[PDB]
Write an enzyme that holds these catalytic residues in place. Structure first.
Site, PDB file in Angstrom:
ATOM      1  N   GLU A 128    -193.707  16.580   2.939  1.00 53.02           N
ATOM      2  CA  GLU A 128    -194.077  17.991   3.043  1.00 53.02           C
ATOM      3  C   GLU A 128    -194.513  18.348   4.461  1.00 53.02           C
ATOM      4  O   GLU A 128    -194.195  19.424   4.965  1.00 53.02           O
ATOM      5  CB  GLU A 128    -195.193  18.337   2.060  1.00 53.02           C
ATOM      6  CG  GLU A 128    -194.737  18.273   0.613  1.00 53.02           C
ATOM      7  CD  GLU A 128    -195.860  18.599  -0.352  1.00 53.02           C
ATOM      8  OE1 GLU A 128    -196.046  19.793  -0.657  1.00 53.02           O
ATOM      9  OE2 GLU A 128    -196.566  17.663  -0.778  1.00 53.02           O
ATOM     10  N   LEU A 129    -195.276  17.466   5.087  1.00 51.80           N
ATOM     11  CA  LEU A 129    -195.700  17.713   6.460  1.00 51.80           C
ATOM     12  C   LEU A 129    -194.490  17.796   7.387  1.00 51.80           C
ATOM     13  O   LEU A 129    -194.448  18.667   8.259  1.00 51.80           O
ATOM     14  CB  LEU A 129    -196.658  16.632   6.954  1.00 51.80           C
ATOM     15  CG  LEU A 129    -197.136  16.861   8.393  1.00 51.80           C
ATOM     16  CD1 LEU A 129    -197.928  18.185   8.523  1.00 51.80           C
ATOM     17  CD2 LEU A 129    -197.951  15.687   8.906  1.00 51.80           C
TER      18      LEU A 129
END
Length: 162
Positions: A74-75
């Site tokens: 996600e990052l």
């Protein structure tokens, strides 16, 4: 439907500081999407799509953030989106310093190194963690008044929306 994506890990964090943050944002008529903070196995493509559709992401780094390969991916997505300019990211450092994130220090780092052992994506991940803190964020340290920090985040989100 949402404007703000809240990216984090930890059921305790969800039930404590994040509950107050979400309540205050909704009180200020800001619609939010909450991350898969327990990694139940919510489909990654949907999470990534949610992130992309967001105007603002709050990336809340804590000690539990790096235990999750999914949270780290996600990052990656957050970083890609911010580089291209399709969303605004606000890093939140919950009981850790920006240097701890950028240099992968302490439990935050140790957990990352444990999770990412042998993974070919490791170098790209380190780079995302190095770079995201180059964006000005909000620090919540052990001596912060949490209500004041909630207000700080809400003001930043509104500024980013307007």
């Amino acid at each position: 439907q949402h404007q703000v994506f809240i990216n984090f890990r930890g059921a305790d964090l969800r039930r404590r500081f994040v509950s107050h943050l979400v309540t205050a944002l909704k009180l200020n008529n800001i619609n939010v999407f909450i991350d898969d903070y327990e990694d139940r196995g919510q489909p990654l493509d949907v999470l990534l799509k949610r992130i992309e559709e967001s105007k603002i992401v709050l990336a809340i780094f804590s000690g539990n953030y790096t235990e999750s390969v999914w949270c780290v991916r996600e990052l990656e997505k957050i970083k890609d989106c911010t580089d291209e300019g399709t969303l605004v990211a606000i890093p939140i450092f919950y009981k850790l310093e920006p240097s701890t994130v950028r240099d992968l220090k302490g439990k935050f780092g140790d957990r990352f190194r444990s999770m990412a052992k042998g993974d070919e994506r490791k170098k790209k991940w380190k780079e995302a963690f190095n770079l995201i803190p180059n964006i000005m964020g909000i620090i919540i340290d052990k001596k912060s008044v949490e209500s004041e920090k909630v207000n700080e985040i809400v003001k930043a989100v509104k500024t980013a929306l307007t």
